Amino acid sequence: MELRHLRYFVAVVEEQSFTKAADKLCIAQPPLSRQIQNLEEELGIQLLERGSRPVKTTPEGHFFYQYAIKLLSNVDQMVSMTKRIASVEKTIRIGFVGSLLFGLLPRIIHLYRQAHPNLRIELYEMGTKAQTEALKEGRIDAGFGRLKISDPAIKRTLLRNERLMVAVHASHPLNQMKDKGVHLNDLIDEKILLYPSSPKPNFSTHVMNIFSDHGLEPTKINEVRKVQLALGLVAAGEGISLVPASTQSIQLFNLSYVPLLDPDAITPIYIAVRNMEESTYIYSLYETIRQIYAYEGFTEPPN
Amino acid sequence: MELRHLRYFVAVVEEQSFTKAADKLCIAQPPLSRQIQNLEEELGIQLLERGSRPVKTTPEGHFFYQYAIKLLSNVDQMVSMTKRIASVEKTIRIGFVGSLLFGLLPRIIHLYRQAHPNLRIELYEMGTKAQTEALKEGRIDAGFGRLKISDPAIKRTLLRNERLMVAVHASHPLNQMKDKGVHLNDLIDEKILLYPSSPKPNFSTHVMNIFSDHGLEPTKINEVRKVQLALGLVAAGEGISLVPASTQSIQLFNLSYVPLLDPDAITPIYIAVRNMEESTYIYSLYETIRQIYAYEGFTEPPN
């Protein structure tokens, strides 16, 4: 009834002794009968003789020695034979923070898509927390995000430092300084719109740290589900909001973007991958980012 | 790694549901996942889904399905195979004519073999005459042949009359008769290819007999080592050939087989043994023919 009852029988025959029988794979001494007897007197057979020195093969049991080593080798043949199959070939899984969709990300993916028309590219928008979990659980192969990951099991790389801008309605007093810029210090009175109210830590918290980081803690906040909502509420004159430079892909009537002069009013973009990562597909993706940056006149991240 | 992992997998696929899946023997309900994953995430495989109604099989996990009905049935026929034994020390040697490999003989032999997993079977290909000499000398135990043998020492039985047909090139006027059929008389003017050229008296002589018995003696004649040569040469347009019906196992582009209409244009198939032959084994060979013949619809030979 079991495959375990057949490896045990091989051990008694092929060793041709009792004084020497520990040579194969994980073997004891006491249950070298209880494992054999279940096989024997159940459906109705009795195999070897017990059992002088050395062992001689038996009429009924020797054929059982012929058919067992073949029936055993079949499962180890047909497993590995079942391995011989992969579906939709090689796949590359990529996690990312939605905020990046307004940046160079889609374009980067497009080129990696062309250079590798061979493989399947899956794209999941997930937070940094989730990306960490996904990378370590092998669910994704690479992640893009805004904030650092503390976790020795992941390697992170800064790709570029991105500039933070203030979103304001056109007729806002701050807009007078559109051509030079304001400092963070100027914003602390304004009703501020943070986003996205969703899996922490996200861009919301990042902004808050930037203020903390600068000795500012503004107590006129309103957290809001997402960016377009914030930009919308802002273009309706609810208040202001901090946004990454790339978000300038969204132009609403009477919505103005003002730079921040504070040298460190910056949001970063990292790539993270599994710690011991060698895959040519990842390196290629990497070199693709490098290729695209090269184009934009941006600095290049090193090997 | 165990037969247990195969007895639980069949109980889900053949049942098509998780609501009711217990048509087999001795199966629980809570451990319906721990006993399934042991086979998979150890050697590294992924199979079925989890799990809508009804559960559909996956491409990779469908290759596992067959084999799982082949190896579980190797264990189920293992119980009803080892009680058949009679201890390997007796060899049965069988003599046959090359011709007979295109018909029931191999199928015959396989089945016999399966009835007697204890016996060692040796198959020697030899002309009906060497067979006759070999049987008397005891160097073979049963002989299958086309030709008849005048010997008191031999005991011959007619297994069945096999039909003759005409190998023709597709573009031959006679191919027009593929469904009705031709008479030996239609063949005289044609070039006939005969086979084999070997120690006489062989299938060539048989064909020559069949013609003269019907009063016909054709002169446009050429012998040829083997049937492959006859047929293949016919495919090239070097003439026509007469073959056992069973030789339609070989098929070749623009080789076409035409049936003969002369009720006696037959080739017979005999078994030969020693006269005073009484071995259960030969009796057992013979009953195997009777089963194999019953299957295919052919008339059985007597007792």
Side-chain angles (χ1 to χ4, degrees):
Chain A
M1 58 191 183
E2 293 291 323
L3 271 179
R4 200 164 71 256
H5 300 139
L6 304 172
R7 266 203 172 93
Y8 274 78
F9 183 78
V10 173
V12 191
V13 186
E14 282 195 328
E15 295 300 312
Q16 269 179 301
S17 189
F18 270 86
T19 327
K20 295 290 197 172
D23 273 53
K24 201 188 172 176
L25 295 158
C26 281
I27 33 199
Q29 278 291 327
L32 206 97
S33 300
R34 288 184 299 272
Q35 285 293 112
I36 309 288
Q37 298 311 122
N38 292 8
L39 177 85
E40 285 183 309
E41 289 201 57
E42 192 187 294
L43 281 164
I45 53 159
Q46 275 155 145
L47 305 158
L48 292 184
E49 272 217 330
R50 292 93 182 261
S52 53
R53 312 178 185 101
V55 186
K56 186 185 176 177
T57 47
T58 160
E60 289 78 16
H62 178 243
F63 174 73
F64 198 85
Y65 171 65
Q66 278 196 16
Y67 200 64
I69 53 171
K70 192 172 186 170
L71 204 150
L72 285 165
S73 203
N74 266 184
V75 206
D76 266 310
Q77 185 206 106
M78 296 222 58
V79 168
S80 293
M81 200 80 77
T82 315
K83 172 68 197 180
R84 294 176 166 206
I85 338 278
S87 62
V88 207
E89 286 280 24
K90 193 49 161 48
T91 304
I92 288 307
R93 300 186 173 77
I94 293 183
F96 65 91
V97 163
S99 148
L100 290 186
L101 304 158
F102 301 106
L104 295 166
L105 182 62
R107 131 165 51 188
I108 294 156
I109 290 315
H110 180 88
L111 193 40
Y112 179 70
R113 195 160 272 176
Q114 314 307 284
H116 299 292
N118 34 112
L119 94 179
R120 177 180 183 84
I121 301 170
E122 303 187 338
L123 298 143
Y124 310 88
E125 190 227 43
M126 37 168 59
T128 288
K129 224 276 99 152
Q131 272 172 41
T132 303
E133 290 172 15
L135 268 172
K136 280 189 299 166
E137 278 167 31
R139 268 175 296 119
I140 63 175
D141 304 314
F144 301 84
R146 288 287 191 202
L147 38 163
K148 301 120 168 143
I149 305 166
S150 194
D151 196 328
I154 279 85
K155 161 71 180 158
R156 206 177 66 256
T157 313
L158 178 60
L159 306 177
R160 90 184 179 92
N161 275 321
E162 184 178 353
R163 208 69 211 160
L164 271 183
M165 301 192 80
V166 187
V168 308
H169 177 83
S171 68
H172 195 282
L174 284 155
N175 202 33
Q176 285 30 64
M177 228 61 251
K178 189 180 182 158
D179 281 336
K180 166 79 159 290
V182 309
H183 288 97
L184 304 164
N185 195 44
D186 291 303
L187 325 171
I188 57 150
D189 292 334
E190 316 303 295
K191 185 78 178 279
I192 285 178
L193 307 188
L194 310 175
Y195 59 87
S197 49
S198 35
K200 272 175 177 55
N202 42 24
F203 180 69
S204 170
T205 45
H206 175 77
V207 170
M208 271 334 219
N209 298 342
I210 291 301
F211 279 100
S212 221
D213 200 31
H214 285 77
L216 298 162
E217 281 116 13
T219 49
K220 268 180 256 178
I221 296 312
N222 170 29
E223 238 222 314
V224 151
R225 209 165 50 83
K226 235 287 153 213
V227 81
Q228 71 253 44
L229 232 174
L231 297 175
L233 284 168
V234 160
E238 269 284 342
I240 65 164
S241 175
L242 279 78
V243 293
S246 57
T247 320
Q248 290 186 250
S249 287
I250 310 163
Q251 290 298 327
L252 309 171
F253 187 87
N254 279 351
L255 167 51
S256 204
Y257 293 110
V258 170
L260 290 164
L261 289 168
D262 304 90
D264 327 295
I266 64 164
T267 173
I269 316 172
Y270 308 97
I271 187 150
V273 289
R274 257 172 303 275
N275 212 183
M276 297 289 91
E277 178 60 77
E278 263 113 55
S279 145
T280 300
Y281 289 121
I282 299 291
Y283 160 83
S284 188
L285 169 63
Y286 191 61
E287 269 292 301
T288 308
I289 302 174
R290 260 191 152 248
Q291 290 188 61
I292 292 311
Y293 273 39
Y295 287 109
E296 277 275 302
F298 289 5
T299 321
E300 274 196 335
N303 280 250
Chain B
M1 60 177 183
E2 292 288 334
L3 287 176
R4 196 171 58 257
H5 305 117
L6 296 164
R7 280 270 166 88
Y8 277 88
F9 180 74
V10 170
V12 189
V13 187
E14 286 189 19
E15 291 302 306
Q16 287 188 237
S17 189
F18 284 94
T19 311
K20 288 175 183 181
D23 288 37
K24 226 170 187 178
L25 291 162
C26 298
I27 37 183
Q29 196 176 157
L32 226 160
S33 301
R34 296 193 296 268
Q35 293 293 140
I36 317 294
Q37 285 170 226
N38 290 356
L39 178 86
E40 302 181 59
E41 283 191 53
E42 189 188 317
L43 296 138
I45 35 158
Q46 291 176 132
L47 288 87
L48 295 172
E49 284 195 324
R50 214 90 138 272
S52 59
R53 314 177 191 88
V55 182
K56 208 197 87 170
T57 50
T58 47
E60 259 89 330
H62 197 260
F63 163 74
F64 198 84
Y65 183 61
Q66 24 258 184
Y67 142 70
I69 316 165
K70 189 264 170 69
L71 274 202
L72 200 146
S73 193
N74 267 175
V75 180
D76 291 356
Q77 86 155 310
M78 190 169 59
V79 198
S80 173
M81 175 113 83
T82 326
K83 264 213 154 178
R84 274 188 169 95
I85 68 95
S87 191
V88 194
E89 261 145 330
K90 177 64 155 85
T91 311
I92 289 299
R93 297 168 186 101
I94 307 153
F96 71 96
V97 149
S99 157
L100 289 174
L101 298 162
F102 296 115
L104 303 175
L105 188 59
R107 173 167 7 171
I108 279 154
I109 301 313
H110 194 65
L111 193 66
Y112 190 49
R113 217 189 215 98
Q114 256 79 214
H116 306 262
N118 53 90
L119 178 96
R120 170 173 154 83
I121 312 171
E122 292 159 22
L123 315 181
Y124 301 120
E125 192 256 333
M126 34 160 73
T128 293
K129 177 185 81 185
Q131 290 191 13
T132 301
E133 215 181 332
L135 271 160
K136 277 186 271 171
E137 291 162 52
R139 297 190 275 98
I140 58 163
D141 302 311
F144 295 82
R146 296 262 177 207
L147 278 267
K148 301 183 201 183
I149 37 195
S150 193
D151 209 318
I154 271 71
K155 166 77 210 102
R156 180 177 80 239
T157 344
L158 168 82
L159 307 168
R160 78 177 189 96
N161 292 303
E162 203 191 353
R163 299 290 315 154
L164 282 174
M165 25 203 314
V166 187
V168 299
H169 179 100
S171 97
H172 194 289
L174 297 165
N175 197 22
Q176 276 24 48
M177 307 322 297
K178 211 170 168 166
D179 308 302
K180 183 46 187 285
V182 296
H183 289 82
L184 290 171
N185 202 74
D186 300 309
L187 312 188
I188 53 159
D189 277 305
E190 306 294 310
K191 172 163 183 178
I192 312 98
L193 288 130
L194 300 164
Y195 67 91
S197 62
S198 81
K200 274 177 134 45
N202 46 64
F203 179 75
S204 170
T205 76
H206 184 71
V207 180
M208 271 309 192
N209 291 348
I210 302 290
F211 274 114
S212 77
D213 181 40
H214 287 76
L216 307 163
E217 281 107 21
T219 43
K220 233 167 286 171
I221 297 305
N222 181 29
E223 216 184 21
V224 126
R225 266 205 318 122
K226 231 332 165 163
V227 56
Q228 14 187 311
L229 259 140
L231 305 186
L233 231 47
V234 158
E238 270 279 353
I240 76 159
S241 208
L242 281 77
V243 291
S246 59
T247 93
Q248 295 184 237
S249 296
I250 307 177
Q251 292 289 318
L252 306 172
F253 188 87
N254 281 6
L255 176 64
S256 185
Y257 294 105
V258 176
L260 280 170
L261 291 191
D262 302 287
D264 305 301
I266 65 179
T267 156
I269 305 181
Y270 309 101
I271 185 162
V273 292
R274 290 170 289 260
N275 213 264
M276 293 284 95
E277 188 53 54
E278 305 197 335
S279 190
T280 307
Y281 296 117
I282 304 302
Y283 164 79
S284 180
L285 179 63
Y286 189 55
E287 279 285 305
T288 309
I289 307 162
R290 272 167 154 259
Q291 272 171 48
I292 279 314
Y293 271 46
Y295 286 117
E296 282 266 329
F298 293 94
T299 324
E300 280 177 314
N303 264 341

